[PDB]
Subunit: 385 residues, 4 copies
């Protein structure tokens, strides 16, 4: 039957993650937002505490944690700073592909190292000309003997300048009329390969401590052994990846939303206007309630999507609903949080305007709001067949 | 660990409720909505199938089902018609108080005869002058020997003119300065008692086959033996009743919402405009997506609240979220379904306009939309103490 | 410069319309909703008072009022009952086409008679297979000498069974690849022409006193002299019509919205809960304010669209915005009105649930909500060219 | 009669403001937002072009423009940058009080020198302890001979560290039981007066080039000659100021919204995904439509409010609607513009993220979003009496 009870092991990860977020992230998060330095020390910690690369199988020195587990950890982390957290998350983004489409040699090689040093990796799909339209990418992969020559340009790559290796999706079928299901190939590319031209750190509105970059690939030679499953299987790998990664990204949005709520509640229970506490103005108490409603709903949705994949079933439909819902109410709570703070809310000396800046990517990265509806509509309708 | 998996026992109640709802209710729901006629045959049948009085403990010949089961069943019945379903629901509204505040003697007699015949019962609290403000009821109860004398009027009573007996909440402490927590008493009043004047059948916008009435109590004598826990324990019984009742009303709502979604989808996959199916217009596909999203979110909310109470914990916070959210989306979906149908949707020969009329009570009865935010806010703030 | 001041003449129409609506419609509107009788006596009055066929030029015994004028009158009428008002409005719907695409003989003939007796007319575009997609209609118009044989079926025709004559749009170019701009013809069809098979009165959710019917056309012979501008000019006539008619339909939605507000305010300033007036609960006062905000915005929008066409310029963009906005907030106010009324709001003895039933067609008829966005998007984008 | 036509004089101010805004502001607004630097050159230029201090009566060398003109101009400037524009706006905030409650002597000296040089002024009311609750300010004024002694602190003062003089609202009646209507006094305080301690430049989320500061008054001596109408007429002057000030702040909002709409449209007509322009995806076309709708609605609202005050009537109701609606849509549009841009939108090298940061104050400053509903509700109910 139904059960919304965490396991003992889960409660302990959660506690560990919560302590780290509230005692180590939070007190330093504000400064990193202002400076935009890579939160190296935070990451070195996360790793040591085992709150990084959680999906890596035990056979490669990993913890081999499930999707439910990661979601649980994520939410706690995100609560502190999604700038920091997204960096951690990007590691999982590049790992999953290898986990579901790599061989022992590949995994042992590239996943193994992650388990030894606090190294970082990244996930290169997006190009200047195509983000949402994956089948629209043009990074070319040309076979030349026992090597593949990669020529293309990637954009908005998280951990782009700090990564040891990249998952890279490239078009390997020059036939313009080739199906998406056969036109692409997934590769593992070591960042120190000649032809790899890492661009400047991009300056964005939010999650400013995160490393986001543009990377150019000029005659990058990749050993055939670096092909994940085989030529043409890149699209399958990419899609399969989302089932596992989408629920955790939703969780991160919930942690943000939860942060916003906590802060707004604290303040509403302190500040006075017209002789009453903010929380005593029915207008405000109603706002807070609607805020609370949404957090709980969003949390439920990722849980549902996570349990599903952990149960070994395609969770596309549920996963897409969570990401979509979590992303929208992270944005609504952020702006409502700034609102209860009044004048102080718009000021850089309070923790909420940052929340408002951060939350916005959730509606864009890893499947925009619109794309999510496309997917839900397809999965929904598909059921009437 | 998390689980969203139904038991094998749950799977068959669900199948029983689903077969009855779509093979018996559906085919006649429209004719009942038009006439307003009490659906005795369906109720009769519902009783035989064991889809009524579902919470009655086994000792009293009941099934002794939990809140989760109720919700499961409820949602299927609701799918068919909320007009019919609320009749069923009313019975449970009347029973819970007894089950949580009645002695063995009271339960055996009053719960026991529900199990023997297809009887109905009602819950009498609301008055012409007070609905939301429960602490504002005025139907007085005066202790006269080994009996109580009831004087008052009750309005908007489901199964009002069809009940064998009523749970009746009356003010037993004439001091207007008496704490709500001590001023009321719960009673089991038999409908045939001299002095009960059953009003006319009220004509409402929706749920038209449901019997809703005003009732007047003129020097109604009730044996002190019919007092639930004792004099002054009225409020506690009423408030405690919602913990178990809230989830199931929420399920009815996402039942009527599931109906809305289904119909809308079916039509969208049939109707053509501008040379394409409705579903093929991104504007519609997006609508359907949002609709889908909401149903799923609502479902999860009343599960979360149901599990909680079944776990033997006060679920007020969760139950409020669920009732509030499900009621809202039920209303948005019903209007969007009519929308997808265009001109046919506004027509009485199609199944969605009825849905639109029906869905509105969810935002009113069993704690209005506003009232819910009060509860939520109150419960949420509590957590910051 | 700017001016939001009515003229003396306008103030007087407005007063006349307001008195009629509040003193004659209102007190009888409830009964007509229940019975669904055609409000003949109300219409005979409207005519006599000159609140009907206001756009008919003076040369044909009309008042030759502008679009601003009609909007002003409409809003007042609608306030009383949109069931009644829509009947009046349907007259204008069938007249405009003749006004912008007919000749003297035609006008003098068909408009003239309207000015003599309290006759009714209608507007037949919609078919079972096409409403939104005007270019998708299939009512065929075949030239045979000095006559045209009409074979087709129309649906949802307002005044359908009470009309003296119909504006009828038919496809006159059998070439399936003919442009919409040349494939259709507009005709004037006397209702008593053999082949005209008027269907049953349709039963809809709202505006139930309105006559809505299905009409079949079997070998209906129409004199060539009944062609409005000429063969192929039907599409131009249809489109041109909207510029003039859309603002008045928006106005009618505002009158409904305004009615809802008035009623909700009255009640909120009467009813007490928790020791305070409903209007004293910040939660409610905020609801009412948002309600008021929307009415004023919607009123502004139709005014803008009306002034534009009266100024002799295509007002498509503004007109489409008004209809769209007015329609949505008529629906929001209706449901919010039922909400403040609580339990009584869902009851047939109060004036708001009807408002909720009526308001729904505004999002469907005369350009659905979605179609409106299509038009706005086209007109908006067009400006970036 | 209605008119939405600008005068020939209005057309040229509009052209002047439009040329300056998009040829001078736009090209440098981004660099000012990054640095936070006060845009003296633009202000200087704005003064020369006569787009500043626009309400100053001609007698004092001003233009003597109405509220409508202000709005017209405001909206164009705002389009360019609200950071720059609020600096301009602040001046007017400081001037109005003087213009409606000052004697000839006061006006000549203080308004007069604004016309001679490019000076700035500020409006000081808000305090660290009270912003929304004006009747809760505590900066005291003690009459000491033919002078007043000011003691208090003011927070969030636009042009705080750049003002020649301030309008300052202080409590002149120590009785805490004194009616708000009689407890305050308005003052013109020169910035160079011994005792004024100008705080640091506050760092906010948006409008970063705008000078916002906290100010402390320590035994500041103000000649009784600097008292506006008299002791106790403070509240009346402040409240009366919003009637004229509300509309223009609303215009700034629909200025920043117009910018959002333009950019979004431009990109949608350039970017391709799934083989089509963004604008060609009904999901986007619909978004743009809604965006368009809102800008137009907001525009009409502050026109309606502007006309009203120019007509010599209290516009509180209308001005509140406008400020409230425009502030909201400004926020929705800014987020939707970032949305249309995808990943580029979140990037600092594109013009919309800034818009998103900027737009938020509209829901806070000059009567929060909540405060506005209070005013509206109060004004609306008044009409039912
Ligand atoms: C901070 C940041 C970090 C990122 N990190 C990574 C990373 O680590 N790895 C990586 O590969 N990528 C990353 N991304 C990129 C991300 O995957 C894309 O930004 C996102 O998928 C959107 O694609 P786009 O930016 O090309 O927008 P576009 O695809 O150009 O879309 C523009 C807008 O149109 C909408 N749209 C597009 N097509 C349709 C359609 N058919 N119907 C309706 N609406 C449509 C979109 O929803 C969007 O709002 C990152 C982006 C950002 C901003
Ligand atoms: C950039 C900037 C520039 C400014 N410029 C000026 C200036 O030039 N001159 C000046 O005098 N002021 C200025 N202000 C201040 C501004 O007017 C106030 O911030 C605004 O009035 C809100 O007050 P507050 O900050 O005290 O928030 P609070 O009043 O503390 O309100 C906090 C929150 O509670 C809500 N709230 C408060 N009371 C109620 C209630 N009764 N019912 C319901 N909700 C309620 C508010 O809506 C808000 O959401 C500026 C502020 C900013 C940020
Ligand atoms: C009470 C009533 C009175 C009426 N009176 C008249 C009258 O007097 N004369 C007359 O000619 N007609 C009349 N109509 C009909 C009216 O014009 C149509 O009902 C309306 O245009 C909708 O068309 P439809 O009903 O065919 O719905 P459909 O066109 O089938 O559309 C179904 C749904 O899909 C949406 N949709 C369709 N195409 C698209 C698209 N390309 N993109 C996105 N969404 C889309 C629509 O918005 C709608 O919600 C009346 C209708 C009603 C209900
Ligand atoms: C079809 C139907 C069946 C019903 N069945 C039963 C039944 O079986 N047993 C039973 O006991 N009752 C029953 N009820 C009554 C129902 O529970 C009440 O209608 C509901 O509690 C609302 O109360 P009210 O009608 O008195 O509205 P009111 O309490 O008068 O409220 C009016 C409006 O003001 C709002 N409001 C009230 N107080 C506040 C506040 N403090 N702050 C903000 N907003 C506020 C409400 O949300 C509502 O919008 C039924 C009602 C209906 C319509």
């Amino acid at each position: 039957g139904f059960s919304f009870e965490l396991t003992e092991q889960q409660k302990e990860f959660q506690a560990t993650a919560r302590k780290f977020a509230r005692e180590e992230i939070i007190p330093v998060a504000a400064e990193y937002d202002r400076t935009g330095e890579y939160p190296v020390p935070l990451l070195k910690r996360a790793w040591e505490l085992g709150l990084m690369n959680t999906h890596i199988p035990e056979s490669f020195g990993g913890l081999g944690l499930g999707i439910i587990d990661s979601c649980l950890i994520t939410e706690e982390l995100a609560y502190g700073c999604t700038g920091v957290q997204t960096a951690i998350e990007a590691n999982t983004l590049g790992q999953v592909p290898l986990i579901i489409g790599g061989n022992y040699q590949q995994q042992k090689k590239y996943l193994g190292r992650m388990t030894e040093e606090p190294l970082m990796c990244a996930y290169c799909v997006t190009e200047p000309g195509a983000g949402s339209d994956v089948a629209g990418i043009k990074t070319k992969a040309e076979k030349k003997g026992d090597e593949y020559i990669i020529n293309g340009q990637k954009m908005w790559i998280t951990n782009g300048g700090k990564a040891n290796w990249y998952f890279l999706l490239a078009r390997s079928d020059p036939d313009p009329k080739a199906p998406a299901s056969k036109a692409f190939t997934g590769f593992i590319v070591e960042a120190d390969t000649p032809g790899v031209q890492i661009g400047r750190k991009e300056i964005n509105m939010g999650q400013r401590c995160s490393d986001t970059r543009g990377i150019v690939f000029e005659d990058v030679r990749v050993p055939k052994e670096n092909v994940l499953t085989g030529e043409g299987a890149g699209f399958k790998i990419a899609m399969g990846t989302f089932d596992k990664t989408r629920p955790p990204v939703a969780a991160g949005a919930v942690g943000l939303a939860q942060r916003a709520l906590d802060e707004a509640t604290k303040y509403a229970l302190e500040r006075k206007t017209f002789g009453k506490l903010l929380a005593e103005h029915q207008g405000i108490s109603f706002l807070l309630a609607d805020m609370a409603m949404k957090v709980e709903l969003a949390r439920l949705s990722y849980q549902r999507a996570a349990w599903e994949i952990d149960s070994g079933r395609r969770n596309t439909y549920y996963a897409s609903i969570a990401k979509a819902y979590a992303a929208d109410i992270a944005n609504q709570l952020a702006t409502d949080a700034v609102q209860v703070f009044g004048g102080n809310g718009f000021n850089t000396e309070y923790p909420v305007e940052k929340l408002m800046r951060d939350a916005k990517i959730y509606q864009i990265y890893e499947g925009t709001a619109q794309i999510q509806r496309i997917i839900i509509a397809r999965e929904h309708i598909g059921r009437y067949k």
